[PDB]
From a paper:
Cytoplasmic incompatibility (CI) results when Wolbachia bacteria-infected male insects mate with uninfected females, leading to embryonic lethality. CI is caused by linked pairs of Wolbachia genes called CI factors (CifA and CifB). Protein-binding experiments and expression of cif genes in yeast have shown that CifA binds its cognate CifB specifically and rescues CifB-induced yeast growth defects. CidBwMel consists of a region, which is predicted to contain two PD-(D/E)XK (pseudo) nuclease domains (residue 1-751; hereafter CidBwMelND1-ND2, ND: nuclease domain) and a C-terminal deubiquitylase (DUB) domain.
We determined the crystal structure of the CidBwMel DUB domain to 1.85 Å resolution. Similar to the structures of other proteases in the CE clan/Ulp1-like protease family, the DUB core consists of a five-stranded β sheet flanked by α helices on both sides. His957, Asp976, and Cys1016 form the catalytic triad. An active DUB domain is required for inducing a CI-like phenotype in transgenic D. melanogaster for cid operons. The crystal structure of CidBwMelDUB provides a solid structural basis for further investigation of the molecular targets and function of CidB deubiquitylase family proteins. Given that bacteria do not possess a ubiquitin-conjugation system, the presence of a DUB domain in CidB strongly suggests that this Wolbachia protein functions within the host.
Author numbering: 837 to 898, 903 to 914, 922 to 981, 984 to 1086, 1089 to 1121
Write the structure that this text describes.
Amino acid sequence: STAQGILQQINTILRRNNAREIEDVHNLLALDFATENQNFRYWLQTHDMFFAARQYTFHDDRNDRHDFAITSVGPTGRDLLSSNIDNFKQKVDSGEKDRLTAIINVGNRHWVTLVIVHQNGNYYGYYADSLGPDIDNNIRGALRECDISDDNVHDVSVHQQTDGHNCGIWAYENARDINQAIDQALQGNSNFGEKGEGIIGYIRGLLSAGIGNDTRQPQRNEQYFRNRRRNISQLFQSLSSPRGRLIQGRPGIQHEIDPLLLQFLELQYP
């Protein structure tokens, strides 16, 4: 069986059940289904990233001073992220927000993190890509259309992964740590300096924790990311994934589609 063979079989079942056919089998995959079958190389999609946000306490709660957005780049390639940064800058002017955390899909299944803080009239930004130091043009173009100065946006990336499949979780690990570094800098642990650059070394200390030669716990090895995947998957228990919407719309169809999805997972992500 091939991926297209599986897709044709799924689409026959969807047709019999008066549901919309799909164009890619990934449309019906989600982190919980993959993790329940021990496919830990599954790349997290946009719908999975909403559940991961709740695991890292981002969806809300960290009404409060922090803004949060899951967006993408690549209408113009920049409109969604630009719109989020604009809405944030308005809320800063309204006195409602101090900080924005954005988790950004840069197109080819790659997730990166951008955190912007406002402190007494200035906007400082910190960008992290788990692949290591390189910033993406659409990100830079979104920042330029929102008048965030390039001098005040800093690439704090550290080499953390090469496999690619865990960049979705690394994006949240890095957002947590950038936000902790900013929090501690506000309390005097470090100084921002004129352009916000002063905290970059402290950020990189947290981003490098538990990888390579660093012995700090948790060691963020493959087993660590398997357990994070298991923990994120527990939050799925429905309507927020395309799979969950199909199941709720056609209860019991999972008995016909899940065997084929498992075959696809074995092929795409062995």
